[PDB]
Design a protein around this ligand. Structure first.
Ligand SMILES: Cn1ccc(C(=O)NC[C@@H]2CCCO2)n1
Ligand SMILES: Cn1ccc(C(=O)NC[C@@H]2CCCO2)n1
Lengths: 263, 265
C-alpha cells in the first residue's frame, strides 16, 4: 500500500484468501466491498487522518455513506492478487465522492470498479448539513480536475431507485447482526447490508448467475439490537429491486438494485 | 507464506485490517481463527494437496474438526503484522493434530497459540474412520517425526473433558442462522462461525470489561444452511469462566459445547 507519485490517489495489492471465496472459488462481493473499505482506510491514514479532519473532530462531524455502486467484470479467484486504486473528490457543498478501480496484478486489466457518495452528519444528533468551507479546503488530497471511475453519461450509478411494493416476490426475514458484523465503533459494518440485501435472492439465481452490478442507497443505520427483513422482486440478464426494513415498524433502512449475468 | 527450511512447518505474515478489529482496536478472536485456517490452507497447498490425499479422494474421505483450542496473550492491533507458524502431526489411528504459534513481527514474542484435533470421516455417510495405514504414510512425510506440541505442559487446558450445559442457562442468544457469508467454498458453515455464535451469549458487559484469554470448542455436528441455532452460557467460577452450548432451536440437537476464560483488562 502506497500513495501514487502525485499523492492524489492510493494503491494496494491483496492476495485473495481461502475463506473469502464462494462456491465458484472466486472472491465474494462482500470480500470485494471489504477490500474497497480497507484501501480507503489506508489512503486516509497515509495522508494524515487518525483512527475526519481537525475541524470535523472539534465540532462532532462524521462522514456517512449515502450510496454505494459496484460493477464487477471478473471476480479474483482464490490465490490471485488484485490491485485496487482509490481516490476522493469534492462533489461541491453536497458532500464527498470516493472511487475505486480493481485490476489484475498479472494482466493489468480492469476487472471491476466502484463509486460511493458520502454526506456529513453530526455524530450525536444524526442530522446532516454540508456547508463547511474550511472542511472543503482541508481539497489538497484530491485531484482538482474530475477523475471518475464511472465517466459515461447515463450510467448505472446515478439512477433514482424506487421503493419495493408489497408483496415482495422473495424475502429473508429475522436478520440480526452479531459482534462480527460490528465495526471498531460498535456500529453495523455497511458491508453487512450488502450481504443482507442478497439474502433474499434465491439460491438458484446465485448458482446459475454471477452478480455484475449492485447499487445500494443507505437510508438509516441498523442498531445492534434491531431485526431486519430483506425483500426482492424481479424487474425484468436478471434485474432485481431490493428493500431492507425493520421487522417491527417496517422502517426503511436500505433500498437497491442488482444485475446478474448468466454463467 | 513459505515452508520453513526443513519443509516440516509453514510460516506466514499478516497485516491486521480495519474491518478485522473490535472496540479496543485489536483483532477479534474470529479474525485470529480465520488467519489460522488461512495459514493451514496455504501449508496444505504448498506441499501438494486439495487436505485430502490420493487414498482420501479415492474413498470419499474428509478431515473434519473435532476440537479447537485457542490461547491468546496479546491481540495484534489494527495495522500490526502477525507471523503464524503451523504444522501437522499424526496422532496414531485417531486422526491428525494441527498446531499454531502466533508471534509479533517486530518483537518476535509469542502473542498466542492454538491446537486442533481432526478425525477422518466419509463425506457422504458421515461415518468416522480410524485412520488407515496407507493414508498415514501419505502425509507422514510432511510431519515432524518427533513430537512438536504448541501446548506441551504436563497439565494443559487443551485436553480437558467439557461437560454439557444444564438447563436453565444463565445467558442465551436465540434464533441464530448463517448467511451466505458464513458459508465456505463447499457451501458448508465455516467452523469459525460457531466461535462467533458461542460468544453471542456472553453478556456485553463481560466483553466490554474483559479480554478473551482461552477458548476450547468441541464440534459434535454441523449446522446446515437452513438450520437455526440457540447459544447458551453459564458462569462456572480477577478471572471469568463460562460453560457454553450450541443446539438446534427446534429439537434441541447438540452441535457444539465449549468453555471460555476471560481476564480483567
Ligand atoms: C441512525 N441513522 C440515522 C441516519 C443514518 C444513516 O446512516 N443515514 C445515511 C444518510 C442519511 C441520508 C444520506 O445518507 N443512520
Ligand atoms: C452431520 N455431521 C456429522 C458430523 C459432523 C461434523 O461436522 N463434525 C462432527 C464430528 C464428530 C466428531 C467430530 O467431528 N457433521
Amino acid at each position: 500500500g502506497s500513495l501514487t507519485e502525485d499523492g492524489l490517489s492510493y494503491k494496494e495489492k491483496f492476495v485473495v484468501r481461502s475463506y473469502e471465496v464462494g462456491s465458484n472459488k472466486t472472491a465474494t462481493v462482500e470480500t470485494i466491498a471489504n477490500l474497497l473499505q480497507e484501501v480507503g482506510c489506508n489512503h486516509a491514514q497515509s495522508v494524515g487522518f487518525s483512527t475526519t479532519t481537525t475541524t470535523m473532530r472539534k465540532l462532532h462531524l462524521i462522514w456517512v455513506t449515502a450510496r454505494m455502486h459496484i460493477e464487477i467484470y471478473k471476480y479474483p479467484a482464490w490465490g490471485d492478487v488484485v490491485e485496487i486504486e482509490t481516490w476522493c473528490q469534492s462533489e461541491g457543498r453536497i458532500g464527498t465522492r470516493r472511487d475505486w478501480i480493481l485490476k489484475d496484478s498479472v494482466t493489468g486489466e480492469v476487472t471491476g470498479r466502484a463509486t460511493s457518495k458520502w454526506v456529513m452528519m453530526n455524530q450525536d444528533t444524526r442530522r446532516l448539513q454540508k456547508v463547511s468551507d474550511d472542511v472543503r479546503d482541508e481539497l489538497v488530497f484530491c485531484p482538482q480536475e474530475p477523475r471518475l471511475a464511472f465517466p459515461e453519461e447515463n450510467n448505472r450509478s446515478l439512477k433514482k431507485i424506487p421503493k419495493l411494493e408489497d408483496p415482495a416476490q422473495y424475502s429473508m426475514i429475522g436478520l440480526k447482526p452479531r459482534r462480527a458484523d460490528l465495526d471498531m465503533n460498535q456500529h453495523v459494518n455497511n458491508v453487512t447490508y450488502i450481504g443482507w440485501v442478497l439474502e433474499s435472492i434465491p439460491q438458484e439465481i446465485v448458482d446459475t448467475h454471477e452478480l455484475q452490478v449492485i447499487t445500494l442507497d443507505y437510508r438509516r443505520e441498523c442498531q445492534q439490537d434491531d431485526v431486519v427483513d430483506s425483500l426482492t422482486t424481479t424487474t425484468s440478464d436478471s434485474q432485481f429491486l431490493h428493500l431492507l426494513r425493520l421487522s417491527g415498524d417496517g422502517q426503511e433502512i436500505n433500498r437497491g438494485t442488482t444485475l446478474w449475468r448468466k454463467k
